[PDB]
Amino acid sequence: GHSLPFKVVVISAILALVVLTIISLIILIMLWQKKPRYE
Amino acid sequence: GHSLPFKVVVISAILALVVLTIISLIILIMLWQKKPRYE
């Protein structure tokens, strides 16, 4: 666009979005076996 | 990047890296104190 190509920007954004779900997944199951959940 | 502006990509990426660390910090302190804190 002005300096760096959108190529690196996109790949970086998408990936960062994926890891957020991964790191969150660990917490979900972790707490799932600690404090019971109410349905 | 053939539709939406490149701006949203950059902001989303940088923001994703910031929150990623925060997600990890919550687990660290959570396990550091084990039991929740009240009052």
| B14: its two tokens | 């940088």
A25 at interface of B, judged by CB pairs closer than 8 A: no
> d(Cα B3, Cα B9) in Å, to the nearest integer?
11
B29 at interface of A, judged by CB pairs closer than 8 A: no
Q: Around Cβ B9, how many Cβ atoms within 10 Å? A: 20
CA distances in angstroms from B36 to A26, A39, B7, B20, listed in the order given: 18, 21, 39, 22
Selection from A17, A27, A16 nearest residue B24 by Cα: A27
Selection from A7, A36, A31 nearest residue B27 by Cα: A31
- For residues B22 and A20, the answer to whether their CB atoms sit within 8 Å is no
Select from A7, A11, A12 the residue whose CB has the most chain B CBs within 10 Å, as the one to mutate to test that interface.
A12
